[PDB]
From a paper:
The core proteins of SRPs and SRs are GTPases that each contain a structurally and functionally conserved NG domain where the G domain adopts a ras-like fold responsible for GTP binding and the N-domain adopts a four α-helix bundle fold. Here we describe the X-ray structures and solution conformations of FtsY, the SR from the hyper-thermophilic archaeon Pyrococcus furiosus (Pfu), in its free and GDP•magnesium-bound forms. The low resolution, solution scattering data complements our high-resolution crystallographic analysis and shows that the crystallographic structure and the average conformation adopted in solution are similar. While the overall architecture of the archeal receptor resembles its previously described bacterial homologues from the SRP/SR GTPases family, the structure of Pfu-FtsY reveals novel features: The elongated N domain lacks the N-terminal extension observed in all other bacterial FtsYs and is instead characterized by a long N-terminal helix αN1 that packs against the NG core in a different way; sequence analysis suggests that archeal receptors may cluster apart from their bacterial homologues.
The apo receptor was crystallized in two different crystallization conditions in absence of guanine nucleotide and its structure solved de novo using single wavelength anomalous dispersion of selenium; the structure is therefore not biased towards any of the previously solved homologues. Our Pfu-FtsY structure is the first representative from the Archaea kingdom. The αN1 helix of Pfu-FtsY is not bent and its axis is shifted towards the core of the four α-helix bundle resulting in an overall more compact, albeit extended, N domain.
Residue numbers in the entry:
A (entry chain B), B (entry chain B), C (entry chain B), D (entry chain B), E (entry chain B), F (entry chain B): 0 to 23, 38 to 318
Amino acid sequence: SMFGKLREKLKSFVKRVEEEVEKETVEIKEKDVDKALDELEIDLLEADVALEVVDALREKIKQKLVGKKVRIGTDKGKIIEEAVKEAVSEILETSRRIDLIEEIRKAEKPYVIMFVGFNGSGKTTTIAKLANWLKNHGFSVVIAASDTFRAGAIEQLEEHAKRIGVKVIKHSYGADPAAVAYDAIQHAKARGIDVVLIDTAGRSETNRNLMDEMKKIARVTKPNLVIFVGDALAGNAIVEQARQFNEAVKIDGIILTKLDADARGGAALSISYVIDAPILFVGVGQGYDDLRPFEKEWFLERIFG
Amino acid sequence: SMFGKLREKLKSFVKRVEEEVEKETVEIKEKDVDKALDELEIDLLEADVALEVVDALREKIKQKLVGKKVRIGTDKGKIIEEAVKEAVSEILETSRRIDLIEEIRKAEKPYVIMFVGFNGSGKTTTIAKLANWLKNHGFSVVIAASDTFRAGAIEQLEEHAKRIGVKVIKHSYGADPAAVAYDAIQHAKARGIDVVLIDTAGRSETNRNLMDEMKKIARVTKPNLVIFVGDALAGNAIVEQARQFNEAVKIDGIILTKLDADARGGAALSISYVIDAPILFVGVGQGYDDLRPFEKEWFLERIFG
Amino acid sequence: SMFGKLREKLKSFVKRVEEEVEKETVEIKEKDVDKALDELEIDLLEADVALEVVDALREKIKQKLVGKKVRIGTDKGKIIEEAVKEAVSEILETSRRIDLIEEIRKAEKPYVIMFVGFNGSGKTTTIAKLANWLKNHGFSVVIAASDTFRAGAIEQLEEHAKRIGVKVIKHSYGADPAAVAYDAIQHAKARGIDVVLIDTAGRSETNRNLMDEMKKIARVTKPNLVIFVGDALAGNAIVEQARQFNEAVKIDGIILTKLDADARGGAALSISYVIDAPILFVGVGQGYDDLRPFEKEWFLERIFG
Amino acid sequence: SMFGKLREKLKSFVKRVEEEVEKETVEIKEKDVDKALDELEIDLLEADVALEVVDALREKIKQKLVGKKVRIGTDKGKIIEEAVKEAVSEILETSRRIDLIEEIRKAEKPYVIMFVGFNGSGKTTTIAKLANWLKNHGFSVVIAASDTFRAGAIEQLEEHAKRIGVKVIKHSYGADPAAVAYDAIQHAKARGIDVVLIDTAGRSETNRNLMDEMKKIARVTKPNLVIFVGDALAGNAIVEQARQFNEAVKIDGIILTKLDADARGGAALSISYVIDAPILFVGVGQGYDDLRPFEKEWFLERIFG
Amino acid sequence: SMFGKLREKLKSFVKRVEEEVEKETVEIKEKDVDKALDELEIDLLEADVALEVVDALREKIKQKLVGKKVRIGTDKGKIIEEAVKEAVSEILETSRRIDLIEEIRKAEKPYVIMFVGFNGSGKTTTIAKLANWLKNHGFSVVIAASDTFRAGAIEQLEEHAKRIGVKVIKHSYGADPAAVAYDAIQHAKARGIDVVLIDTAGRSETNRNLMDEMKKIARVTKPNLVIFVGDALAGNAIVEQARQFNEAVKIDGIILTKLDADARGGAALSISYVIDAPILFVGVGQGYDDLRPFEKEWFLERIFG
Amino acid sequence: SMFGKLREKLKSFVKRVEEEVEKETVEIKEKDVDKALDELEIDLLEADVALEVVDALREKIKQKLVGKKVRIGTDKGKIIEEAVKEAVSEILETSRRIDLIEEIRKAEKPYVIMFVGFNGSGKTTTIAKLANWLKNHGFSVVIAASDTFRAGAIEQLEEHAKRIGVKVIKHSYGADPAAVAYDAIQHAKARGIDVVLIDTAGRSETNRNLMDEMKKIARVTKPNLVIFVGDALAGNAIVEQARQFNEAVKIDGIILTKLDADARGGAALSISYVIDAPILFVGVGQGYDDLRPFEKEWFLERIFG
């Protein structure tokens, strides 16, 4: 339940190599892994795995399995499957990890966090849930409603924020996004508020280019942290989405929403490696505590079942 | 908390009439109500109230207040406010009510329900929640995944449906929507399943007009019930959305999502009167039981505080 | 200078018939006019003349010229050219004429005028100029800024209106258009203002269909007069534009802008006949008094030079 | 090779009924055909067969098979397969047939033919090929280039037409389509030309609605025959395309292009029944003689293999 | 009347600092200006002032006011208001000024001027008005109609140009823009004409990218001067518009239209600083002489009232 | 028949220079060629010739004709016309030529060829025709159907490929393009197939940028050869189309389709010079052998007649 397509293709690679070892102590032949890896590349490409992740996986798996001897009679599966597990693990932990709580505590207040992402990414609810998480840890929070052309989205943010006791700074419909965020930062300075979260637009407006707007807000607010948020069910999209954003304003961390429904998993496996930024939180449900700090070992076990 | 703009404008009308009675047993003069009602019309139009609802409100309020005597010394507010309450109540209960459970029990199985609405309406999660509600009442359910160009939306539906034990009938990406629904109906016939719910597209596709597609599915599946679903936060939209749908395929019932965040309320007040269909359920939160059967008196008290 | 293409094609028809009379008292033969009229139809169609106007012209010209004798030696040109002049004149004066000033004087105040047209039609400046014209005639005027998504257009209207002493009623960006117009009508009632002019949107908005919006405003404001405004330089467009509008809300009168630059003239010749509404004013320049009451004889002489 | 999906689903229905007869002189039971027909409906809907054709097929097949006795030992397949063949045949020959050559011979010249269809339908090459076919039969032809915003398409038409000795009437880029066609008709009158073919636009232009333009051309040219052309490979499209066109201007005949590559066949099977117009020619290749007069028996044998 | 929002926010900053000096010879404290400047930044951002202009203003105002002593009893307002005036003045006069008349006189003829800007900028009428201005100064002028897909715009240009005696070089609808401009330059060489003005497209065409087209015309015509034209009422737009253009072809000078109606003023204040090009002319009305050479002191007094 | 506009403008330049020599052994004066070349530049720009080709032509023609003496009485035309012929010839043969057959023979199999181009370019039929050409030369071929969102285009490719005995590798609708191509390369390795041809998308998809997709496929498949295909009738387009593609992935060779209908010829003359890649094949008809290897001398004679 989760990552089925990715898991099934990884298992099919283990079984192919195991066949070669059966027909065949014996040694695992490079020619045999090369062939099976060619089939795996086809499968992973169709499962939304980025090429550079496919290439890194080939490199790691080859280096781990070529030269290896299967003591005749033992359990092949686990030797081969152990190389694959290690390869996958290594591509997850490439990005330098970030301890949000320690970064905030040690920083001069307010710690300001800018969110980027396209509409449908789950950005607005993520911000409310993160505000709640921060408060449960003893931090005060204020939210800047800089998504100024979506009255509906702001109403929804306002309703979630009232419930958990965090203030939303907003101006009138169509206001300048950067002015709203700068306003929230001043308000936070005056009240000794620990963290400012910036809710941004997720689509261009008439003569207001999305990437240009993100650069302006970044220049105006000088964020401590830029977080990309992406919808895991949009497999064929999130990685290219994060590439565009990263190109306008460097991404520090990633949050993936609706991960519990992600039956594929190639994009989720790839994004951290490609963007070179750690996954900080995963959304795994519709309740507030359904935003969990990312746990590598939990992720790995969901991939391998 | 909810319907603030609507409530504030209704209260401002009560206060204006009360002023007239104070400056002024005295009698409440038609000229005085007419004037205050002109100001109310301006206010309700800016709060997304449909004109025909504004007109019905004027007619009812006028008929209830003109000729009425305020015993000098008593409480004016409650006499005037009582007319307004009755007027609003009468526009809510214009549509003939539908008892879903009794309609299903008495019908030949399967009872088939077609949903219509644009993307963003909350249609997909509503269907899962309604399936859950039906099961809690002893009905078996199957879902037809006829929204065949949204792989992400279907994954999400599949995940919710597995959790509550209802089967999803789906075909491959881009399949014919009507064929999927007809497939689910046959499957339901074979297994003695009580209810079939049809999850439809919410946007046009290249050479596949949304309204034309809805007519085809209706003709193919002959639904017992057609339910429009609409997002309450899209005040300026839901009523015109339902008008278009009603025009292609007659709407029997309405479900409004995200009502807990609706700080305005004019559209929600209007939609049943305009479409001449009862509101069956309201979405008031992110949990499954956050889809509640519509309760008129609860609604009225949320409007008047 | 003006209407050159139309004039040149009409003259070319006169010359062709005159040739036939020369080669040939003699009589003007129906076969000869029929042939020359076939060539004229080709020419007028390429000059934006609507088919039903082409057909009416053929019918009138044929009836006027067939059977007619040219006294051999006289001036042919003027006999033939006189039929054409009469035909053109008759298609201009098909619509029942409207005396705006007498309609206003005799009406119960305020007299309300709704304008319709697509952006680029010159609608906004036309309204200011008409307000000025009305004031020069002793009428008080107020303008409703119901084009609520164009901040730039409203600024421009505000600036023109301040200069001539007329008040503009406006709400905030994105407000409900009908509420603004109803507001201006109440304001006019309170101040004894003679005329209300309604400045409307000229393009659809996200989930706000232009024709649907025009019907709502009409229902809310119950205008005495609906005026279509169109840009004469958009030859291939204005007639179809007016057809669409007429279909949603009946057009009473037409104003054509930028007529002084119209080197073609087929559309301007056609529009009144097709819509069955008189041209009330023509825009012939950039100054305020460059909006002139339509004068049939002036128009005819501009066509024939 | 051709119509594989349609054929495979029809065969699968025959085999299901045959199973029922085997497990089971015996008689073919209505309950058995009903069930198998429910599965066929699912299959035909997914193969682009229109519902009303699915319904007519059910009606005919049921009437032909219910009550029928299979003499025990004989060949079931052919009895059942014979009913299906007859049903399919009857839906092909519903429209009254048109003998183009006899219609032209008996008509007053020029016989004018207007073509309608969206770009990509193969309309432009079809017109050239039909012109060639007409000439091989002794008719003179002229082509009106009324697709006036596609310089590339007209160049291609001009090149094909020069090769077969037919004249193309064209004006300058962006000219009025109706004026071009009326021009070609006059030219044809003057030269005693038998047939005029009108090449029309296949997409809307800025302020020039496609259906409105088609009505204008029809009114101006008064065609003897209106031919819809459609691309068979656009299965999910051609029927709705023809519906729209038929709605603006009644369709007399249909030509389907690229039929040799049509591996599906549901739309091609349906279109004549739905539009109530005969298929006149099929395009089965890239050479000029690859436009063949439609032959019902050839079509049937391609469907059944 | 003009620049009200900008003026009101600048005045509100003066009053805040003056309060601090009152509550408080005294000295003006940096902490006090810093605070008030933070509020000013919020206000100027919402008034369309570009960030780099906000930053330059902060830098200049701080440097001018910090350390300054208010002789107790004197007029504070004027000391503070004088710093602000100087700051604003310095951001206006950052770009090196251009004397158009002297540049033309001293140049080898023809002096060629290319205009860039999006449709709605007022580009076409600006060119006619500038041609008139040049002629009033003794220069001969020719206009290249390189906006070849807007027949309406060219008609309007032709009409204005005939009135003032300047020739328009134009080709047929849809012609190559660069060929038209090169044609006008040759024509000017042959007739000893002093100045060529190039009227360009203001929107992309099917497969004709606007910026790519501007580079081609620049390469073909080698202009002496490139002028950006922008509509002042499009506050949220002109600066980004000029950035894009500047990026494809370097801008030498700016003309702002409809400045008399500009009730905001932040964009108009910013554009010269951001683009590093002087404002050459302002449009302040609908008559020909309503295009005025830019006058810094007039501008400043309109800002401060 | 072909290249008429280009030829006519080149001839008009020869005649102008010849006039100068007549009015005038005499010598051909640089001033005379300069003038006539200015007129030629206007003409070639309007015929879709790229500026850098216009510039190279001027440079070559000037160098060849200036200083040249016409022996008085001889044939001027041929001396001048000979310079022009040489100039045109030199711009055609600027790109280093490619012998496809020798490149394939000498390469390690499979030789992989990636095609790029926008829809409507004739890419899909070109690939089938090239496959046929390769087979007639003794090479085995496989086609990768990487244009995965066009079911119709793939059906057509499948039908052409079956006829000539080449296999098409395809996956399901909407599959990952790069995975399909990598699949075809593995299949080719296993069967000893000489050449792999990659059929790519020609338009962007929702969140799948065309140029980004082309880079991915190139990275995944490491093609030996990248071929741009372009439609000659799209004069105003192909050169900019090839520029964009070249920018994402370097173009090695060009194929121009529908050249037999190209009545203009400026773009076809320019493209090789601008892209710095040879034309490998021209499409001159609808049959398979209507894809001809490019022949410079044949091309030149078609240009000059």
